[PDB]
Amino acid sequence: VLRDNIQGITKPAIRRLARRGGVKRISGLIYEETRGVLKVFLENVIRDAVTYTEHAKRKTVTAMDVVYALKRQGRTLYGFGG
Amino acid sequence: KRHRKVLRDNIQGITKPAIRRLARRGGVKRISGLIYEETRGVLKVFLENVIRDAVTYTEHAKRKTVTAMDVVYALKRQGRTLYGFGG
Amino acid sequence: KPHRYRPGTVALREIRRYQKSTELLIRKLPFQRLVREIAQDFKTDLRFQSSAVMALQEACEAYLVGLFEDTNLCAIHAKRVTIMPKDIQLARRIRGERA
Amino acid sequence: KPHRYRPGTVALREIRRYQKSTELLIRKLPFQRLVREIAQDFKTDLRFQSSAVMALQEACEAYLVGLFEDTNLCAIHAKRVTIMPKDIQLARRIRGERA
Amino acid sequence: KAKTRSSRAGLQFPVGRVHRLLRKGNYSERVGAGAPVYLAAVLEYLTAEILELAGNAARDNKKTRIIPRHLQLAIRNDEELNKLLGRVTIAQGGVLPNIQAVLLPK
Amino acid sequence: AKTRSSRAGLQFPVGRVHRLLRKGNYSERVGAGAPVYLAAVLEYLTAEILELAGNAARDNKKTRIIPRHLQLAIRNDEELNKLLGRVTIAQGGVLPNIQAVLLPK
Amino acid sequence: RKRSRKESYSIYVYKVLKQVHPDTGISSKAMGIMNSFVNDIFERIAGEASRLAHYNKRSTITSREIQTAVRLLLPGELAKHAVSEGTKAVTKYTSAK
Amino acid sequence: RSRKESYSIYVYKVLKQVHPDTGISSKAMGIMNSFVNDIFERIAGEASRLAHYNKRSTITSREIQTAVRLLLPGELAKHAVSEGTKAVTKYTSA
DNA sequence: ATCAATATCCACCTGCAGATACTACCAAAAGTGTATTTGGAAACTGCTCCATCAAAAGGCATGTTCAGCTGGAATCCAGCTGAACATGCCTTTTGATGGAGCAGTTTCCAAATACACTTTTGGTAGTATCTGCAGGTGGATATTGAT
DNA sequence: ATCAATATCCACCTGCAGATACTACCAAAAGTGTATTTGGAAACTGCTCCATCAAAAGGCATGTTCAGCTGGATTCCAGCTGAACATGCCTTTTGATGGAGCAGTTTCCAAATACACTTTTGGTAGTATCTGCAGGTGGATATTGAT
Ligand SMILES: [Mn+2]
Ligand SMILES: [Mn+2]
Ligand SMILES: [Mn+2]
Ligand SMILES: [Mn+2]
Ligand SMILES: [Mn+2]
Ligand SMILES: [Mn+2]
Ligand SMILES: [Mn+2]
Ligand SMILES: [Mn+2]
Ligand SMILES: [Mn+2]
Ligand SMILES: [Mn+2]
Ligand SMILES: [Mn+2]
Ligand SMILES: [Mn+2]
Ligand SMILES: [Mn+2]
Ligand SMILES: [Mn+2]
């Protein structure tokens, strides 16, 4: 069956995320709203990561590329180098 | 030979109409009575944190005079960058 | 028969007035006393450049104005038109100032 | 009559379950598809370290979970217990991620 | 006759000074000759962008002298300058006129 | 030959902290005291977290500190939580917390 | 005693103002803002370029580092034009002497 | 092939000093490494700006101290300052 | 819709704060030229680890039904909060003075850089042994929701 | 209150992935010793500007009265979203397998640094003189609210 990739981020997985966030009841429109927010996040972080990749003249996005990008965006991540 | 009078309770110099005006510039139409004391508390926390950092810069330079730059540097590191007084 | 504007009319007039201008809204000398009192509690015998106090007032007024904006959105979100302390608290929590 | 839990009971059970654990909650492969698709828009024929993709999923899931907490506070602020796009939007606005 | 590196680059902004500030700033051990040129050009371009928009705001306010208010109007009304300076306070700049619709009478 | 760490009473590498400082382009010069002080501050902060994380491991009846324990240690400590407020710990999860109004009855 | 020289970007900001708005002036407080702006953006780009060079074990900040820093730091159209203006200035600079 | 430095074995040393019978997983060790690197960068960075603000070319223990006061919350700052002063004292004497 | 009270607009003007203009001065800055050093690009390549492939295995996502209960709409009203007024206080303004302390310049040594050399160490690679605990079991018992 | 249906917890067990303990190897890195350089503390002091003074006055804070309309409580009900169950679809596992490309090594030259010398310039500093617009007035237009 034909399938968009962002639609691969399924309703039940979004549900579990909300539950860890302490959310008890979810509106039907939340699931499309969440996917849109997810996409912007990834776009912003991946754009910065790939930019580090290009500068290093590589073809492989490294964990460090991602880590540096997250730090830029004020989303510092522990556990993957640096 | 002298010393200045004791400084106390100056937070009340932040008057209700002064707080009303700031709310207006912030687009606020209607204000509950408990807002004014809440605002004074919030302002005091903000001012303390910036002054603490500014004075820290002052002492490190071995000065007794807090400069505009001390404040600007303090604001910069608190994530409140300010244009118009500085370097 | 003496004239009275309805509750809300003058408030809206005031919003338009102060969103149009740029001057400081807190009285100058009282703010200066507040700064000296707070600074003194941290360190005695400090002096202030006049521009240093003004920098603090510009920062404080810009901070509060911005906070009232976020506060207003929280109140409207609750289908109110009147800002309340719980609105300020919600805004500061989401801002990460208390979280 | 067959057994049936009241609405909300199982929801609360899930909250306790996932707040206790740390495993990722999005399927690995669909997430990996999404990452490569988005990356392809910035540069073609890219490869990824496995740790790179995992770093992305960790940061992204931690972000959405944090956002949902702030969203929940907004819903409760409006005296609801159901989160709505209205709530996500307010949280992101106040966070400074937009508007 | 000597030529400035600025004139050699076709720039109004000072290349020599920018080069000095890079070395004096402890950003790296070495600084290439192309680096201050590129940086001076970017700084100059951004300055031109803001002054353009601020000059317009001044004009719309029937003024010929740009004041901080005009700089603020130009920045907050431009989506990209607003993003770039989103965590910046312009002293004596005030705010944009903006009243939430639900607050208006009806 | 006695290492500067030994000479200062530290487990953390003073010589390395010094090399990292001057190769980091933080300044033209580095005083001899600076890497000692900094190495000391880093060791102490490491000790404070490992202490609290160890206790978290004990409470869960474990003897090996895992990421989850580091998270519990940090988020349950007012000052460590503030210092690391914009940091996310991989595989750390969140604190158990349910808003009161969501509880039944 | 002569008070030490306080450098600013004023005379350059003023030049660009005249190119852009020939009949428009600028107050000293506004010029103060402009000076804060240039110094801020200088520091952001330089700082980002510094990190960039350090991540890649390079001891030299070249025009290449500045460009990537500008792409990382500026949004959309601003990055596009800034990069263009910067490239243009470098090629012209090197095509001389 | 080349080598990659980390704080791992120093982290482990400090671990056995405070919890002799406690171990630490490699994933958790990665986090501690990130932590030490992060705080190093923060403190060094702030000390750098301090020195520059005051037209100084040297970063001394004085810059490190003021940086720590600026960066760490109340009690953490107090103890860190104490630990720092203690170590520089015992380094002068020894 | 009419009309009256009041805010709002805009033209016109005047005083002056602040911007513009000029000359003189000059220390630092910027450029030029020569000699010397070396960062890192280029080309080749070995070895890591990434992409893909098959291929069950089944765990988990999807579609459906049903109804519990939440969201939102409607209604009411006590009292909070805005508008307006009278009163008069304290902030603002203008200007002067003394001197605290910031800052400019010069002298001078403790400490830091720069090499050369020696020694220690931390990262490493195999190689083999060890163990904390995830995951599975049973059965006790707590919770939930029907009566 | 009883009582049935699940969920949840505790005690124990066992395989193994990941922690560990070991020996050996070595390049880099840290320690040592010596000669050289220099940053910035001291001392001294010129001079900006901060604290404090007085005095007059009107902009604005305070405090009160009055009632408009907002917030909060209550009720009510349509329909949305949770729970449960039945499918079956594709994520997961892992294991092997090219080979892309990260990364290590060698070569070497364009470009950077160091340095001495010459010239240009941007920043006070001292006065001297325009000029944009703030703020005042007056009178025409617009807005708001009662009726
Ligand atoms: Mn006090
Ligand atoms: Mn070389
Ligand atoms: Mn029904
Ligand atoms: Mn309800
Ligand atoms: Mn009064
Ligand atoms: Mn004195
Ligand atoms: Mn060893
Ligand atoms: Mn278990
Ligand atoms: Mn010197
Ligand atoms: Mn009434
Ligand atoms: Mn209402
Ligand atoms: Mn190849
Ligand atoms: Mn000149
Ligand atoms: Mn006017």
Closest CA to D95 of A73, C75, C66, C95: C95
Domains, chain B, ordered by start: 1-87 (1.10.20.10)
A positions 26-55 inside 8 Å of D (CB): 26-27, 29-30, 33-34, 37-39, 41-43, 45-47, 49-51, 53-54
Structure's resolution in angstroms: 2.4
Burial call H17-56: b when 16+ CB within 10 Å, e when fewer = ebbeebbbeeebbbbbbbbbbbbbbbbbebbbbbbbeeeb
* CATH (domain of G60): 1.10.20.10
Contact by Cβ (8 Å): A14, D60:
no
Method of determination is: X-ray
- End-to-end Cα distance, chain E: 73
Query: Structure tokens of C42?
Result: 């941290």
Q: Is E60 helix (H, G, I), strand (E, B) or coil?
A: helix
Does any strand I atom come closer than 7 Å to the Cβ of C79? Answer: no
Domains and CATH numbers, chain F: 1-105 (1.10.20.10)
Distance CA C37, CA G50 (A): 41
What are φ and ψ of residue H82, in 5° steps?
A: -60, -45
CB-count exposure of residue D86 (10 Å: 0-12, 13-18, 19+)? middle
Would an 8 Å CB–CB cutoff place G36 in contact with chain B?
Answer: yes
3-state secondary structure chain H: CCCCCCCHHHHHHHHHHHCCCCEECHHHHHHHHHHHHHHHHHHHHHHHHHHHHCCCCEECHHHHHHHHHHHCCHHHHHHHHHHHHHHHHHHHHC
Task: Give the residue numbers spanning the domain of G42.
Answer: 1-97
Give yes or no for a contact between E68 and E91, defined as CB atoms under 8 angstroms apart.
Answer: yes
Q: How far apart are CA F54 and CA H22, in angstroms?
A: 7
The two structure tokens encoding residue C86:
């719980």
Say which residues have a Cβ less than 8 Å from residue B15's Cβ, sequence separation at least 6.
Answer: C27, C30
Chain D touching partners, 3 or more CB pairs below 8 A: A, C, F
Please tell me the number of Cα atoms within 13 Å of C82 on its side-chain side.
Answer: 8
| Nearest CA distance, C90 vs chain F (angstrom) | 14
Strand duo A60-61 + B30-31: pairing = unpaired
Residue H16 CB: number of other CB atoms within 10 A? Answer: 14
Sign for the pseudo-dihedral over CA of F21, F27, F29, F32: negative
Per-residue 3-state assignment (H helix, E strand, C coil) for C27-81: CHHHHHHHHHHHHHHHCCCCEECHHHHHHHHHHHHHHHHHHHHHHHHHHHHCCCC
Pairing of strands B81-83, H23-24: unpaired
Closest of A45, B82, D48, B55 to residue H70, by C-alpha = B55
Question: Which of F25, F27, F29 to mutate to probe the E interface, most E CBs <10 Å?
Answer: F25
Chains with 3 or more CB pairs under 8 A to chain B? C, E, G, H
Q: Provide the token pair at E33.
A: 């000759």
Query: For chain D, how many structural domains are there in total?
Result: 1
Q: Is the dihedral of CA B41, B44, B50, B52 positive or negative?
A: negative
Cα distances (angstroms) measured from residue F20 to each of F25, G55, G83: 9, 13, 33
In chain F the beta strands, taken as DSSP E runs, fall at 29-30, 64-65, 87-89
Give G82's contacts (C-beta < 8 A, 6+ positions apart). Answer: E41, E42, E45, E46, G70, G74
Distance B30 CA to ligand 11 centre (A): 13
Chain B residues within 8 A of E95 when measuring between CB atoms: 25-26
Residue D68's Cα: distance from chain center in Å?
Answer: 7
- Which residues of chain H have a CB within 8 Å of the CB of B73? 49, 53
Helix pair C28-42, C50-77: axis angle to 10 deg: 100
